[PDB]
């Protein structure tokens, strides 16, 4: 486009619409659940899920220390901060993946996981793979908005 | 297809006469054969000698009996079970149940039917493309999807002898191909000069 100020440029891009090209760039529009929008639910479930004690996991180089958390059922839980700072290892241990140095975490759960940075390293081809995993999640029309249509 | 007979005491009479004429009498069992293969079978006797008719029509084996000196009352237990004819020919016991037994026509099985032998599936490719291979799973035969084909892991026994064939197994069964039984004639009994043979 033509060039645009700081303000004005990032305004425009938000709506998903410019005027004098006249095209909508973006089918949707971009919006945030309110959190008044969200369902309202006695959330317990199991009355709450599992929790961790106090962990630790200590590289010998790094070392990374956890605060005794809850967890509960239907929830979600963002994990933030800088790379670096164990964000990865916590989540390797809650997979069970890794071992701690301290604390433990036995769950009787099934866990799925999905790691951070994807090279891969499994023979076979996409399809194969993904329906090894499930079929049926495949034939879904929640996955065909979001995975199959889009890429193609 | 109206009302007139239908007839009651004239076709025993005619049946009366068939048991008397011929030498060799047996019990045979149609329910499975198909009647391409019925007929056919039928077709082979029919030169050689002759089947006909009952109900309980047909017990009255008695009548004859009556008529002559031979059995009543006597038999074992009157061994006549679903599905039931009468063949009379000239031809001795033996050969008969070797033209019969033998010779079958093919035929896949059927849901809700008891297998009459052990049934199995091959392991290889079904050559079939991706798609609901859980159906297979279900019934206990494994099966896994390998070179983007579904293909049978292992040879195993999805159903006994003497054990009922379930709906779902008998027509995942029929879509592989698999089939295996021997229709035709199911021979119960004989008849020879005073002597009862069982099966």
Known sequence: ????????????????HIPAENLRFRTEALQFRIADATEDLQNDSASRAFSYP??????GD???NVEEGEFSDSEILVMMGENGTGKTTLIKLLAGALKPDEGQDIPKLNVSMKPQKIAPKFPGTVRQLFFKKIRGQFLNPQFQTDVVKPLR | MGGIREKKAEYF?????????????????????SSQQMHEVRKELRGRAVVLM??????????????????D???????????VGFV?????????????????????????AVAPEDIWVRAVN?????????????????????????????????????????????????????????FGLTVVQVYDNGQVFPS
Do not use: C, H, W
């Not at chain 2, 009952?54 to 059995?71: C, E, H, Q, W, Y």
């Not at chain 2, 006597?74 to 006549?80: A, I």
């Not at chain 2, 159906?135 to 006994?160: C, H, M, N, Y």
């Open chain 1, 1 to 16: 486009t033509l060039p645009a100020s700081v303000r004005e440029g990032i305004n425009i891009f938000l709506d998903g």
């Open chain 1, 54 to 59: 106090s962990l630790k996991k200590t590289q």
């Open chain 1, 62 to 64: 790094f070392v990374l």
């Open chain 2, 13 to 33: 009479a005619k049946l009366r006469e068939y048991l008397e004429e011929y030498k060799s009498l047996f019990v045979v069992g149609v329910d499975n054969v």
């Open chain 2, 54 to 71: 009952g109900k309980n029509t047909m017990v009255r084996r008695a009548i004859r009996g009556f008529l002559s000196d031979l059995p």
């Open chain 2, 73 to 83: 009352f006597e038999k074992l237990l009157p061994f006549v079970k679903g599905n």
């Open chain 2, 88 to 112: 009379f020919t000239n031809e001795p016991l033996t050969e008969i149940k070797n033209v019969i037994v033998s010779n079958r026509v093919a035929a896949p099985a059927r849901a809700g």
């Open chain 2, 126 to 182: 079904t050559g079939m493309e991706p798609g609901k291979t859980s159906f297979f799973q279900a019934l206990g035969v494994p099966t896994k999807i390998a070179r983007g084909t579904i293909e049978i892991v292992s040879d195993v026994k999805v159903v006994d002898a003497g054990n009922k064939v379930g709906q779902s197994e008998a027509s995942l069964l029929n879509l592989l191909n698999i089939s295996p039984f021997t």
